[PDB]
Symmetry: none
Subunit: 528 residues, 2 copies
Amino acid sequence: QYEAFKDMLYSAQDQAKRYFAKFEEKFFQTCEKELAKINTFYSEKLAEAQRRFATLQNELQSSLDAQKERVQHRNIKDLKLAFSEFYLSLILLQNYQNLNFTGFRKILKKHDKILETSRGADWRVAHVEVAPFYTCKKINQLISETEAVVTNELEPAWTTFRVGLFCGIFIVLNITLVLAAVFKLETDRSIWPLIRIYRGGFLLIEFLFLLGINTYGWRQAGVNHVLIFELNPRSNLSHQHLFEIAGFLGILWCLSLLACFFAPISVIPTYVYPLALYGFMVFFLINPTKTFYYKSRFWLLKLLFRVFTAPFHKVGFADFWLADQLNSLSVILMDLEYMICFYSLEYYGVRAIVQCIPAWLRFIQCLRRYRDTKRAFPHLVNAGKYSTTFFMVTFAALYSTHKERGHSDTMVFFYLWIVFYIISSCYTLIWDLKMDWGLFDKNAGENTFLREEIVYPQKAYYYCAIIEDVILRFAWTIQISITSTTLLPHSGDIIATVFAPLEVFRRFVWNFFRLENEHLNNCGEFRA
Amino acid sequence: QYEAFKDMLYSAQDQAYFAKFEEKFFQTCEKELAKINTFYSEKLAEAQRRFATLQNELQSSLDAQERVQHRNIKDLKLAFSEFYLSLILLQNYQNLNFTGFRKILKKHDKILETSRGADWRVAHVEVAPFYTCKKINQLISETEAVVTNELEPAPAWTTFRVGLFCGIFIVLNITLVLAAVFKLETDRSIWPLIRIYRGGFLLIEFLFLLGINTYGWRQAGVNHVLIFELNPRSNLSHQHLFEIAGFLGILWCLSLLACFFAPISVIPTYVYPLALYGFMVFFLINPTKTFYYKSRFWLLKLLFRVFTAPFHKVGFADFWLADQLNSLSVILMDLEYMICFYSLEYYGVRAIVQCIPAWLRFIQCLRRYRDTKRAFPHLVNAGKYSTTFFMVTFAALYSTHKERGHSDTMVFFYLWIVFYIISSCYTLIWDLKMDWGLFDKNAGENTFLREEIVYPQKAYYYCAIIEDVILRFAWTIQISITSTTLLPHSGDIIATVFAPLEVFRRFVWNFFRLENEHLNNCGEFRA
């Protein structure tokens, strides 16, 4: 009785220590009574489902044994419907469990807000979270069993229109960019090596686009990203939303660049359009209003705030995901730093530290994880894996310094860098192929060099992904070292650019496989 | 028990006598019909009792109209919400069982190769109370109205295509505007060529507006599908018209941009419009079975029928397309100008080719008179459309005599002006009285409207009326001048800026005429 709970809370508030205290026992007693009712009704129906499952399975087994004609054919059709309706019941009970749990959580939160007390959350954790109706996973077990048995034995418009709009405008504007740059760029001076470094928000845009594709892939394959990301099922962000938002940012970026090449109103200088774009982006993200996906924007901002101060807060799954995401999205941070730099002016070493900061964040997050769980494995291995990049980049910078300046110790540091370009790459590759993806499983015979259970349709996906990741991991390390400007005056600003999109591509594939593994296996002990 | 009847039929076929089985089959059919009829009635009676109770509770709650009252309103909202669901379930029960009797009985006919199943359906099922009883719909409507007053699908892929084409089209239009404004360093005779090739653009604008017509018709309640008799089960939703229009738009914009810019020099400037007008017809005339082969084939058949109207019977679709082509004469003039110019680079047959849609429509009306023999409202209509003939002829004669300078130019000017006014008046009154049905005597509350009204706000009628009044004058003057009286340079611009306005006029005219044809049978095309 959620609504009547709310009515009681409002009546107590309006009818207002002894008064509040006496009211406190009453609602808890009401909460206890409702909890028992839900617990009882849950247990009875759950028991009924188990009996029905047994009866259906025996009937299915008996029908199959005779099969191993018309009377049999009708029975199979009858059985399929019986499991179909039965499957619906399990979902209903499965939904039943969530709604009551949500109501308890939400209503007890309101009592806390109204009475400005923490007793509600305490009662929730003491009673509701431990209640059999919530702690009983047999509903999921039954659902999975029914799905497997059936599969084996028996067998918004406006948003989409907006997505189409933005995608079409983006493609046409992109063709416009290509034509203009090829033809209407009558500037032989140092113009490429500036816009070429404004390849910032572009990487962000394509990253969002690939993220939308990731969402679609997880949805279609079956991996439920909503549970692992601790997102509520009632406000899920379909891949269409990511697509439209990516298209919108793309339109903004492309209008900015196109204006930059051409000559809009002369009163406006050419060096403000990138500033306008990047200011509009940040304002849109930090829009304090309640429009334009305020829920999702607030959630993302809270995630970022937690992530950038990882050592203090507990590490959730989203924390780890965003940290690894930013790990490959370092070039964006480097570009932002360079932005600030030459605008303030137009290795003092800030380059390297800003480049490696994502690695620092992930490493310290892993340290916090280890401190909280207090188990060396696998956390210490991650600490080493993410500190190797620190060591590699610092050695790269020092080698650059000595080689340019002239010190004969340059060779030693060259050797150091080349070894840390392998002893680092190898750890990354082996980890992504063994734990984050879980492949090379001993207990996998039919799937060859895969895991025992597979979700995605064709194994060719896994086989090609392995080799592409192998070839591109070394590219990540070499590119991140190069961006530390070893010397590479002019051939480096181009290779880093042409590889950053490849980095995001690798992150796209890695997202697929990491979430697949987590959905099937635990690897990272983040649940339970 | 549909599956049971199917099994009985299959067993009878396999065990094949038939006369005895037919008696058993129909007897079982009757028993099920009685069961369905009885269950429907008691549920319907229960629903009627529930509605009165809830309505009584709502009225009592409304009459007293704090927390107690607020609680009741929420409960009543829920009570009506669940109550509404019950009617839908009962409505579906009615729909499903009737379908089952219909689909089972046809199987009985097919399997036994007899027509007795359809006869039994008509005799028993189609007269059963559970089917004829419309009280379910009345209760549904009453509940909807009560809730709203007192208490308060296109495929994804096609929608995405519509969005993509719309975005590309808007960007291309922006690009053309900027290019013409800035990068047009040609002060020679270029405007009076692309301007007069403002053709297929008019067709695309018409298609876009027609998609809007489809959307509005579907939303209002007017069923364009029945009155167009276009494969009732099938349908071309407004999304499809939108996407096809967007595709033609992308083609048109690309062609004009190429003409403005300088693509590969080997290809000359004068061929891109040829390419566009060839591609459009090829897509329209494609023999293959893709890219809307059904709809394109239907449109081709309609065009062939209408262009040879005097031989064929006149259905509504012929009428509608003839009236559409009446307004879209500018495209025909543009096509004629294109053919003549490409052949050469008042013979002024342009006048004929301009009036020929009127010839089509007028002879079609005559056919509608020879097959029904009732003059009004046809002969009058024939005169309406022959006014176009006479007006254009007088305009051409006046042009010729002004060029020659005979001492009769002023008198012919006066005569052509008088005939202009009379033709405009007659077409206006015809549009306002018959094609729309407004100024109905039996309409008191609706003021100068028809007795019933479909569209939500009368304001749209009250405005479109004056829009038509002011724009019919424009159509007549545009067609008159388009006969190039003298108007050396001041004419080709007004015709161009008015042709889209003509399409807009025809758009609103389509709204109103189909709205009228639904309610009334002013166009005697049914029954």
